[PDB]
């Protein structure tokens, strides 16, 4: 047993560890955008949330950004010309999605574009791509939780965990 | 009040979560004979309205603590739900025009059962009769932001549900006019 979850071989990042890492990222974002005079209504940071599972990351991250004085408005994948855009994704793997999203948003002429991902899987790149902000790295191993799914289940798990091979083989 | 844009805090984050844990226990009890399990038979969460991502993110994790596994779908600005149990989530229920349509549409697919859970219910806003099975907070006719709820797309990130200062929206409203 040892692992808290009967469906996981091991826990990689707890909810608390993820929030701690996300607070470190939020401090950097607060400093990086301090010369942008972000304000609710007049000038929020535009959060563009990409991929269905990212709703969890996105919910926690905007709240933490608020704790740090970075006000936001959210879009899920418009009116962004001259606004700062921060694309959120719960997992960066091949980078094919984020490359397409970033390139498409540039056509709307935002004042700036950066990306922030909860889980970077550098081993999966099919094109070169570096996110400006990375909460945590994961090696080659199939993880679920914190919004990340296996066949639509286990997104609600509060930690990022390694899915036990027996689960997806059988399924 | 620590928010300069708010008249006062109405529901703290902790109060919302406490109330959501009470609701979660009822849901775990209500569905306990449905044999919910991941993959095989999760509860299907249908999340409606853009601001509902915050409520939905917290609620599925809390339902997980209570042994209710889920999968999620979004309807903002459907799938294999026939024979499945469906719980529709919405951060605010007001006129009920949206939820009435979503539920009736979903019923055309003949789920095993369908219920609604809402974070904020404003009973005084109804334009048609509607009662959610599960209600985190019943709110009177005051204008609130936070916990997913916006004013012109801002303030969703506020961790509490707070009463917006009238000056904020009459000043912003006026400004939005100088632009049109
Ligand atoms: N759950 C999980 N998926 C993994 C893992 N390693 C790779 N994948 C792939 C599966 C596929 C679909 O994933 C949507 C998950 P959601 O965002 O809805 O939570 N991915 C992308 O599409 C990334 C966007 P990319 O950079 O590749 O374009 C990631 C892992 O360990 N765990
Ligand atoms: N922010 C805020 N909105 C309030 C309040 N009282 C009423 N409303 C309305 C405004 C309008 C659009 O709000 C989407 C917010 P989001 O879901 O994206 O978070 N509503 C609906 O459309 C409900 C769906 P209905 O039941 O009417 O069909 C709720 C309040 O106090 N505060
Ligand atoms: Mg997905
Ligand atoms: Mg909305």
CSV table of C-alpha atoms and ligand atoms in Angstrom, one decimal:
chain,number,residue,atom,x,y,z
A,1,UNK,CA,0.0,0.0,0.0
A,2,UNK,CA,2.3,2.8,1.3
A,3,UNK,CA,0.8,5.2,-1.3
A,4,UNK,CA,-2.3,7.0,-0.1
A,5,UNK,CA,-4.1,6.3,-3.4
A,6,UNK,CA,-4.8,2.7,-4.3
A,7,UNK,CA,-4.7,3.7,-8.0
A,8,UNK,CA,-1.3,5.4,-7.9
A,9,UNK,CA,2.2,3.9,-7.5
A,10,UNK,CA,3.4,7.1,-5.8
A,11,UNK,CA,2.7,10.8,-5.2
A,12,UNK,CA,4.9,13.3,-7.0
A,13,UNK,CA,3.6,16.7,-6.0
A,14,UNK,CA,1.1,17.3,-3.2
A,15,UNK,CA,-1.5,20.1,-3.4
A,16,UNK,CA,0.5,22.0,-0.8
A,17,UNK,CA,3.8,21.6,-2.7
A,18,UNK,CA,2.1,22.8,-5.9
A,19,UNK,CA,0.7,25.9,-4.1
A,20,UNK,CA,4.1,26.7,-2.6
A,21,UNK,CA,5.6,26.5,-6.0
A,22,UNK,CA,2.8,28.5,-7.5
A,23,UNK,CA,3.4,31.3,-4.9
A,24,UNK,CA,7.0,31.4,-6.0
A,25,UNK,CA,5.9,31.8,-9.6
A,26,UNK,CA,3.3,34.4,-8.6
A,27,UNK,CA,6.0,36.5,-6.9
A,28,UNK,CA,8.0,36.5,-10.1
A,29,UNK,CA,4.9,37.4,-12.1
A,30,UNK,CA,4.1,40.3,-9.7
A,31,UNK,CA,7.6,41.7,-10.2
A,32,UNK,CA,7.8,41.0,-13.9
A,33,UNK,CA,4.5,42.9,-14.5
A,34,UNK,CA,5.0,45.6,-11.9
A,35,UNK,CA,5.9,48.1,-14.6
A,36,UNK,CA,2.6,47.3,-16.4
A,37,UNK,CA,0.3,48.9,-13.9
A,38,UNK,CA,-2.2,46.1,-14.0
A,39,UNK,CA,-5.7,47.1,-12.5
A,40,UNK,CA,-9.1,45.4,-12.4
A,41,UNK,CA,-11.4,46.6,-15.2
A,42,UNK,CA,-9.0,49.1,-16.6
A,43,UNK,CA,-6.1,46.8,-17.2
A,44,UNK,CA,-6.2,43.2,-15.9
A,45,UNK,CA,-3.7,40.5,-17.0
A,46,UNK,CA,-5.6,38.3,-19.5
A,47,UNK,CA,-5.4,34.7,-18.5
A,48,UNK,CA,-5.9,32.3,-21.4
A,49,UNK,CA,-6.6,28.9,-20.1
A,50,UNK,CA,-5.9,26.0,-22.5
A,51,UNK,CA,-7.0,22.4,-22.4
A,52,UNK,CA,-10.1,21.1,-20.5
A,53,UNK,CA,-8.2,19.9,-17.4
A,54,UNK,CA,-6.5,23.2,-16.8
A,55,UNK,CA,-9.6,24.6,-15.0
A,56,UNK,CA,-8.1,23.4,-11.6
A,57,UNK,CA,-4.7,25.0,-12.1
A,58,UNK,CA,-6.4,28.1,-13.5
A,59,UNK,CA,-8.8,28.4,-10.5
A,60,UNK,CA,-6.0,28.1,-8.0
A,61,UNK,CA,-3.5,30.2,-9.9
A,62,UNK,CA,-5.7,33.3,-10.5
A,63,UNK,CA,-6.5,33.3,-6.7
A,64,UNK,CA,-2.9,33.1,-5.8
A,65,UNK,CA,-2.0,35.8,-8.4
A,66,UNK,CA,-4.7,37.9,-6.6
A,67,UNK,CA,-3.0,37.3,-3.3
A,68,UNK,CA,0.1,38.8,-4.9
A,69,UNK,CA,-1.6,41.9,-6.3
A,70,UNK,CA,-1.9,40.7,-9.9
A,71,UNK,CA,-5.6,41.2,-11.0
A,72,UNK,CA,-6.8,39.0,-13.9
A,73,UNK,CA,-9.6,38.2,-16.3
A,74,UNK,CA,-10.0,34.8,-17.8
A,75,UNK,CA,-10.7,33.2,-21.2
A,76,UNK,CA,-11.0,29.5,-21.9
A,77,UNK,CA,-9.8,27.8,-25.1
A,78,UNK,CA,-11.3,38.4,-28.7
A,79,UNK,CA,-10.6,41.8,-27.1
A,80,UNK,CA,-6.9,41.6,-26.2
A,81,UNK,CA,-5.2,44.3,-28.4
A,82,UNK,CA,-2.8,46.2,-26.2
A,83,UNK,CA,-3.4,43.9,-23.2
A,84,UNK,CA,-1.0,41.6,-21.5
A,85,UNK,CA,-1.7,37.9,-22.0
A,86,UNK,CA,-0.6,34.9,-19.9
A,87,UNK,CA,-1.5,31.5,-21.3
A,88,UNK,CA,-2.1,28.8,-18.7
A,89,UNK,CA,-1.9,25.1,-19.4
A,90,UNK,CA,-1.9,22.3,-16.8
A,91,UNK,CA,0.6,20.2,-18.9
A,92,UNK,CA,3.2,21.0,-21.5
A,93,UNK,CA,4.3,17.9,-23.4
A,94,UNK,CA,4.8,18.0,-27.2
A,95,UNK,CA,4.3,21.8,-27.1
A,96,UNK,CA,2.3,21.5,-30.3
A,97,UNK,CA,-0.8,23.0,-28.6
A,98,UNK,CA,0.9,26.0,-27.0
A,99,UNK,CA,2.9,26.8,-30.1
A,100,UNK,CA,-0.4,27.0,-32.1
A,101,UNK,CA,-2.2,29.0,-29.3
A,102,UNK,CA,0.6,31.5,-28.8
A,103,UNK,CA,1.0,32.1,-32.6
A,104,UNK,CA,-2.8,32.6,-33.0
A,105,UNK,CA,-3.0,35.1,-30.2
A,106,UNK,CA,-0.1,37.1,-31.7
A,107,UNK,CA,-2.4,37.9,-34.7
A,108,UNK,CA,-4.6,39.8,-32.2
A,109,UNK,CA,-1.7,42.1,-31.2
A,110,UNK,CA,-1.6,41.8,-27.4
A,111,UNK,CA,0.9,44.0,-25.7
A,112,UNK,CA,2.8,40.9,-24.6
A,113,UNK,CA,2.4,37.1,-24.4
A,114,UNK,CA,3.9,34.6,-22.0
A,115,UNK,CA,3.1,31.1,-20.9
A,116,UNK,CA,2.7,29.4,-17.5
A,117,UNK,CA,2.3,25.7,-17.2
A,118,UNK,CA,1.7,23.6,-14.0
A,119,UNK,CA,3.5,20.5,-15.3
A,120,UNK,CA,6.3,20.6,-17.8
A,121,UNK,CA,7.3,17.3,-19.4
A,122,UNK,CA,10.5,18.3,-21.2
A,123,UNK,CA,11.0,14.8,-22.6
A,124,UNK,CA,7.9,15.0,-24.7
A,125,UNK,CA,8.8,17.9,-27.1
A,126,UNK,CA,8.1,17.5,-30.7
A,127,UNK,CA,9.2,21.1,-31.3
A,128,UNK,CA,11.4,23.3,-29.2
A,129,UNK,CA,9.4,25.3,-26.6
A,130,UNK,CA,10.2,26.9,-23.3
A,131,UNK,CA,7.4,28.2,-21.1
A,132,UNK,CA,8.3,31.5,-19.3
A,133,UNK,CA,7.0,30.0,-16.0
A,134,UNK,CA,6.9,26.4,-14.9
A,135,UNK,CA,5.5,25.2,-11.6
A,136,UNK,CA,6.9,21.7,-11.7
A,137,UNK,CA,8.8,19.3,-14.0
A,138,UNK,CA,7.8,15.7,-14.5
A,139,UNK,CA,10.0,12.9,-16.0
A,140,UNK,CA,8.6,10.4,-18.4
A,141,UNK,CA,5.8,8.8,-16.4
A,142,UNK,CA,2.1,9.0,-16.8
A,143,UNK,CA,0.6,11.2,-14.1
A,144,UNK,CA,-3.0,12.2,-13.2
A,145,UNK,CA,-4.5,14.6,-10.7
A,146,UNK,CA,-4.7,18.4,-10.3
A,147,UNK,CA,-6.9,18.6,-13.4
A,148,UNK,CA,-4.9,16.0,-15.4
A,149,UNK,CA,-7.0,13.0,-16.4
A,150,UNK,CA,-6.9,9.4,-17.5
A,151,UNK,CA,-9.8,8.8,-19.8
A,152,UNK,CA,-11.7,11.8,-18.1
A,153,UNK,CA,-11.3,10.3,-14.5
A,154,UNK,CA,-9.0,11.3,-11.7
A,155,UNK,CA,-8.8,15.1,-12.5
A,156,UNK,CA,-10.2,15.7,-9.0
A,157,UNK,CA,-7.3,14.1,-7.2
A,158,UNK,CA,-5.7,16.8,-5.2
A,159,UNK,CA,-2.1,15.8,-5.8
A,160,UNK,CA,-0.1,14.9,-8.9
A,161,UNK,CA,0.4,11.2,-8.8
A,162,UNK,CA,1.8,8.4,-11.0
A,163,UNK,CA,-1.0,6.2,-12.3
A,164,UNK,CA,-0.4,2.6,-11.5
A,165,UNK,CA,0.3,0.8,-14.9
A,166,UNK,CA,-2.3,-1.9,-14.0
A,167,UNK,CA,-5.1,0.7,-14.2
A,168,UNK,CA,-4.6,1.8,-17.8
A,169,UNK,CA,-3.5,-1.6,-19.1
A,170,UNK,CA,-6.8,-3.2,-18.0
A,171,UNK,CA,-8.8,-0.2,-19.0
B,1,UNK,CA,-13.1,45.6,4.7
B,2,UNK,CA,-9.7,44.7,3.2
B,3,UNK,CA,-11.0,44.9,-0.4
B,4,UNK,CA,-11.1,48.6,-1.6
B,5,UNK,CA,-13.7,47.8,-4.2
B,6,UNK,CA,-16.1,46.1,-1.8
B,7,UNK,CA,-18.7,47.2,0.7
B,8,UNK,CA,-17.9,44.2,2.8
B,9,UNK,CA,-17.1,40.5,2.7
B,10,UNK,CA,-20.2,38.4,2.6
B,11,UNK,CA,-19.0,34.7,2.4
B,12,UNK,CA,-15.4,33.9,3.2
B,13,UNK,CA,-13.5,31.3,1.3
B,14,UNK,CA,-13.6,29.1,4.4
B,15,UNK,CA,-17.3,29.6,4.8
B,16,UNK,CA,-17.9,28.5,1.2
B,17,UNK,CA,-15.7,25.4,1.7
B,18,UNK,CA,-17.4,24.5,5.0
B,19,UNK,CA,-20.8,24.7,3.2
B,20,UNK,CA,-19.5,22.8,0.3
B,21,UNK,CA,-18.3,20.0,2.6
B,22,UNK,CA,-21.9,19.8,4.1
B,23,UNK,CA,-23.3,19.5,0.5
B,24,UNK,CA,-20.7,16.9,-0.4
B,25,UNK,CA,-21.7,14.7,2.5
B,26,UNK,CA,-25.3,14.8,1.3
B,27,UNK,CA,-24.3,14.0,-2.2
B,28,UNK,CA,-22.1,11.0,-1.1
B,29,UNK,CA,-25.2,9.8,0.9
B,30,UNK,CA,-27.6,10.4,-1.9
B,31,UNK,CA,-25.6,8.6,-4.5
B,32,UNK,CA,-24.2,5.9,-2.2
B,33,UNK,CA,-26.2,3.1,-3.9
B,34,UNK,CA,-25.3,4.3,-7.4
B,35,UNK,CA,-21.9,2.4,-7.3
B,36,UNK,CA,-19.9,5.4,-8.5
B,37,UNK,CA,-16.3,4.7,-9.4
B,38,UNK,CA,-13.6,6.2,-11.6
B,39,UNK,CA,-13.5,5.1,-15.2
B,40,UNK,CA,-16.3,2.6,-14.8
B,41,UNK,CA,-19.1,4.9,-13.6
B,42,UNK,CA,-18.1,8.4,-12.4
B,43,UNK,CA,-20.6,11.1,-11.5
B,44,UNK,CA,-20.8,13.4,-14.6
B,45,UNK,CA,-20.2,17.0,-13.6
B,46,UNK,CA,-21.7,19.4,-16.2
B,47,UNK,CA,-20.3,22.9,-15.4
B,48,UNK,CA,-22.3,25.8,-16.8
B,49,UNK,CA,-21.3,29.5,-17.2
B,50,UNK,CA,-17.7,30.7,-17.5
B,51,UNK,CA,-17.2,31.9,-13.9
B,52,UNK,CA,-18.1,28.4,-12.6
B,53,UNK,CA,-14.5,27.1,-13.1
B,54,UNK,CA,-13.6,28.1,-9.5
B,55,UNK,CA,-16.7,26.5,-7.8
B,56,UNK,CA,-16.2,23.4,-10.0
B,57,UNK,CA,-12.5,23.1,-9.3
B,58,UNK,CA,-13.1,23.2,-5.6
B,59,UNK,CA,-16.2,21.1,-5.6
B,60,UNK,CA,-14.9,18.1,-7.5
B,61,UNK,CA,-11.9,17.9,-5.2
B,62,UNK,CA,-14.2,18.1,-2.2
B,63,UNK,CA,-16.5,15.4,-3.7
B,64,UNK,CA,-13.3,13.4,-4.1
B,65,UNK,CA,-12.5,13.7,-0.4
B,66,UNK,CA,-16.0,12.3,0.2
B,67,UNK,CA,-15.6,9.3,-2.0
B,68,UNK,CA,-17.5,10.6,-5.0
B,69,UNK,CA,-15.5,10.3,-8.2
B,70,UNK,CA,-16.3,12.5,-11.1
B,71,UNK,CA,-15.7,13.5,-14.7
B,72,UNK,CA,-16.3,17.0,-16.0
B,73,UNK,CA,-17.8,18.7,-19.0
B,74,UNK,CA,-18.1,22.5,-19.6
B,75,UNK,CA,-20.9,24.5,-21.2
B,76,UNK,CA,-19.7,28.1,-21.5
B,77,UNK,CA,-19.3,31.0,-24.0
B,78,UNK,CA,-23.3,16.4,-25.1
B,79,UNK,CA,-21.2,13.3,-24.8
B,80,UNK,CA,-22.3,9.9,-23.5
B,81,UNK,CA,-24.6,10.7,-20.6
B,82,UNK,CA,-27.4,8.2,-21.4
B,83,UNK,CA,-27.7,5.9,-18.4
B,84,UNK,CA,-25.2,8.0,-16.4
B,85,UNK,CA,-25.8,10.1,-13.3
B,86,UNK,CA,-25.4,13.8,-14.0
B,87,UNK,CA,-24.9,16.7,-11.6
B,88,UNK,CA,-25.1,20.2,-13.2
B,89,UNK,CA,-23.0,22.8,-11.4
B,90,UNK,CA,-23.4,26.6,-11.7
B,91,UNK,CA,-21.8,29.3,-9.6
B,92,UNK,CA,-24.9,31.5,-9.6
B,93,UNK,CA,-28.6,30.7,-10.2
B,94,UNK,CA,-30.7,33.8,-10.7
B,95,UNK,CA,-33.5,33.9,-13.4
B,96,UNK,CA,-33.0,30.1,-13.8
B,97,UNK,CA,-33.5,30.6,-17.6
B,98,UNK,CA,-30.0,29.0,-18.2
B,99,UNK,CA,-30.4,26.0,-15.9
B,100,UNK,CA,-33.9,25.3,-17.1
B,101,UNK,CA,-32.7,24.9,-20.7
B,102,UNK,CA,-29.5,23.0,-19.8
B,103,UNK,CA,-31.4,20.5,-17.7
B,104,UNK,CA,-34.3,20.0,-20.2
B,105,UNK,CA,-31.8,19.5,-23.0
B,106,UNK,CA,-29.7,17.0,-21.0
B,107,UNK,CA,-32.9,15.0,-20.1
B,108,UNK,CA,-33.5,14.4,-23.9
B,109,UNK,CA,-30.4,12.1,-23.6
B,110,UNK,CA,-32.1,10.1,-20.8
B,111,UNK,CA,-29.4,10.1,-18.1
B,112,UNK,CA,-30.0,7.7,-15.2
B,113,UNK,CA,-30.6,10.8,-13.0
B,114,UNK,CA,-30.0,14.5,-13.1
B,115,UNK,CA,-29.7,17.1,-10.3
B,116,UNK,CA,-28.3,20.6,-10.0
B,117,UNK,CA,-25.8,22.1,-7.5
B,118,UNK,CA,-25.3,25.8,-7.4
B,119,UNK,CA,-22.9,27.9,-5.3
B,120,UNK,CA,-25.0,31.1,-5.1
B,121,UNK,CA,-28.8,31.0,-5.4
B,122,UNK,CA,-30.8,34.2,-5.7
B,123,UNK,CA,-34.4,33.0,-5.1
B,124,UNK,CA,-35.6,36.6,-5.7
B,125,UNK,CA,-34.3,36.7,-9.3
B,126,UNK,CA,-36.5,33.9,-10.8
B,127,UNK,CA,-38.2,34.4,-14.1
B,128,UNK,CA,-39.4,30.8,-14.1
B,129,UNK,CA,-39.9,28.3,-11.3
B,130,UNK,CA,-36.7,26.5,-10.4
B,131,UNK,CA,-35.2,24.8,-7.4
B,132,UNK,CA,-31.7,23.4,-7.2
B,133,UNK,CA,-31.3,20.1,-5.3
B,134,UNK,CA,-28.1,21.4,-3.6
B,135,UNK,CA,-27.4,25.1,-2.6
B,136,UNK,CA,-24.2,26.3,-1.0
B,137,UNK,CA,-25.5,29.8,-0.3
B,138,UNK,CA,-28.9,31.6,-0.6
B,139,UNK,CA,-28.3,35.3,-1.3
B,140,UNK,CA,-30.6,38.3,-1.3
B,141,UNK,CA,-30.8,40.9,-4.1
B,142,UNK,CA,-27.3,42.3,-3.5
B,143,UNK,CA,-24.7,42.5,-6.2
B,144,UNK,CA,-21.7,40.3,-5.4
B,145,UNK,CA,-18.4,39.4,-7.1
B,146,UNK,CA,-15.7,36.8,-6.3
B,147,UNK,CA,-15.4,33.0,-6.2
B,148,UNK,CA,-15.8,32.9,-10.0
B,149,UNK,CA,-18.4,35.7,-10.2
B,150,UNK,CA,-17.2,38.8,-12.2
B,151,UNK,CA,-18.1,42.4,-12.7
B,152,UNK,CA,-17.3,43.0,-16.4
B,153,UNK,CA,-14.8,40.1,-16.3
B,154,UNK,CA,-12.8,41.3,-13.3
B,155,UNK,CA,-12.9,40.1,-9.7
B,156,UNK,CA,-13.5,36.4,-10.4
B,157,UNK,CA,-10.2,35.7,-8.6
B,158,UNK,CA,-11.4,37.2,-5.3
B,159,UNK,CA,-11.3,34.3,-2.8
B,160,UNK,CA,-14.4,35.5,-0.9
B,161,UNK,CA,-17.8,36.4,-2.2
B,162,UNK,CA,-18.0,40.2,-1.6
B,163,UNK,CA,-20.5,43.0,-2.1
B,164,UNK,CA,-19.3,45.3,-4.8
B,165,UNK,CA,-19.2,49.0,-4.0
B,166,UNK,CA,-21.9,50.8,-6.1
B,167,UNK,CA,-19.4,53.4,-7.0
B,168,UNK,CA,-17.3,50.8,-8.8
B,169,UNK,CA,-20.0,49.9,-11.3
B,170,UNK,CA,-21.6,53.3,-11.7
B,171,UNK,CA,-18.1,54.7,-12.4
B,172,UNK,CA,-17.1,51.9,-14.7
B,173,UNK,CA,-20.5,51.8,-16.4
B,174,UNK,CA,-20.2,55.5,-17.1
B,175,UNK,CA,-16.7,54.9,-18.4
B,176,UNK,CA,-17.9,52.2,-20.8
B,177,UNK,CA,-20.2,54.8,-22.2
B,178,UNK,CA,-17.5,57.4,-23.0
B,179,UNK,CA,-16.0,54.6,-25.1
B,180,UNK,CA,-19.1,53.7,-27.1
C,1,LIG,N1,-3.2,13.2,-17.9
C,1,LIG,C1,-1.8,13.1,-18.5
C,1,LIG,N2,-1.7,13.4,-19.9
C,1,LIG,C2,-0.3,13.3,-20.5
C,1,LIG,C3,0.8,13.0,-19.8
C,1,LIG,N3,1.9,13.0,-20.6
C,1,LIG,C4,1.5,13.4,-21.8
C,1,LIG,N4,0.2,13.6,-21.7
C,1,LIG,C5,-0.5,14.0,-22.8
C,1,LIG,C6,-2.0,13.6,-23.1
C,1,LIG,C7,-2.5,14.6,-23.9
C,1,LIG,C8,-3.9,15.0,-23.6
C,1,LIG,O1,-3.8,15.7,-22.3
C,1,LIG,C9,-4.8,16.6,-21.9
C,1,LIG,C10,-4.7,16.6,-20.4
C,1,LIG,P1,-5.6,18.1,-19.7
C,1,LIG,O2,-4.8,19.3,-20.2
C,1,LIG,O3,-7.0,18.1,-20.1
C,1,LIG,O4,-5.5,17.9,-18.2
C,1,LIG,N5,-1.6,15.9,-23.6
C,1,LIG,C11,-1.6,17.3,-24.3
C,1,LIG,O5,-2.3,17.5,-25.2
C,1,LIG,C12,-0.6,18.4,-23.8
C,1,LIG,C13,-0.6,19.6,-24.6
C,1,LIG,P2,0.9,19.5,-25.7
C,1,LIG,O6,2.1,20.2,-25.1
C,1,LIG,O7,1.3,18.1,-25.9
C,1,LIG,O8,0.5,20.1,-27.0
C,1,LIG,C14,-0.8,15.6,-22.6
C,1,LIG,C15,0.6,12.6,-18.3
C,1,LIG,O9,1.6,12.3,-17.6
C,1,LIG,N6,-0.7,12.7,-17.7
C,2,LIG,N1,-21.4,38.7,-10.8
C,2,LIG,C1,-22.9,38.7,-10.4
C,2,LIG,N2,-23.9,38.3,-11.3
C,2,LIG,C2,-25.3,38.4,-10.9
C,2,LIG,C3,-25.7,38.7,-9.6
C,2,LIG,N3,-27.0,38.6,-9.5
C,2,LIG,C4,-27.5,38.2,-10.7
C,2,LIG,N4,-26.4,38.1,-11.5
C,2,LIG,C5,-26.6,37.7,-12.8
C,2,LIG,C6,-25.6,38.3,-13.9
C,2,LIG,C7,-25.6,37.4,-15.0
C,2,LIG,C8,-24.4,36.9,-15.6
C,2,LIG,O1,-23.5,36.3,-14.7
C,2,LIG,C9,-22.6,35.3,-15.1
C,2,LIG,C10,-21.6,35.3,-13.9
C,2,LIG,P1,-20.6,33.8,-14.1
C,2,LIG,O2,-21.5,32.6,-14.0
C,2,LIG,O3,-19.8,33.7,-15.4
C,2,LIG,O4,-19.7,33.7,-12.9
C,2,LIG,N5,-26.2,36.0,-14.2
C,2,LIG,C11,-26.6,34.7,-14.9
C,2,LIG,O5,-26.6,34.7,-16.1
C,2,LIG,C12,-27.1,33.5,-14.0
C,2,LIG,C13,-27.7,32.5,-15.0
C,2,LIG,P2,-29.6,32.6,-14.8
C,2,LIG,O6,-30.0,31.8,-13.6
C,2,LIG,O7,-30.1,34.0,-14.8
C,2,LIG,O8,-30.2,32.0,-16.1
C,2,LIG,C14,-26.2,36.2,-12.9
C,2,LIG,C15,-24.6,39.1,-8.6
C,2,LIG,O9,-24.9,39.4,-7.5
C,2,LIG,N6,-23.2,39.1,-9.0
C,3,LIG,MG1,-7.9,17.7,-21.8
C,4,LIG,MG1,-20.5,33.8,-17.4
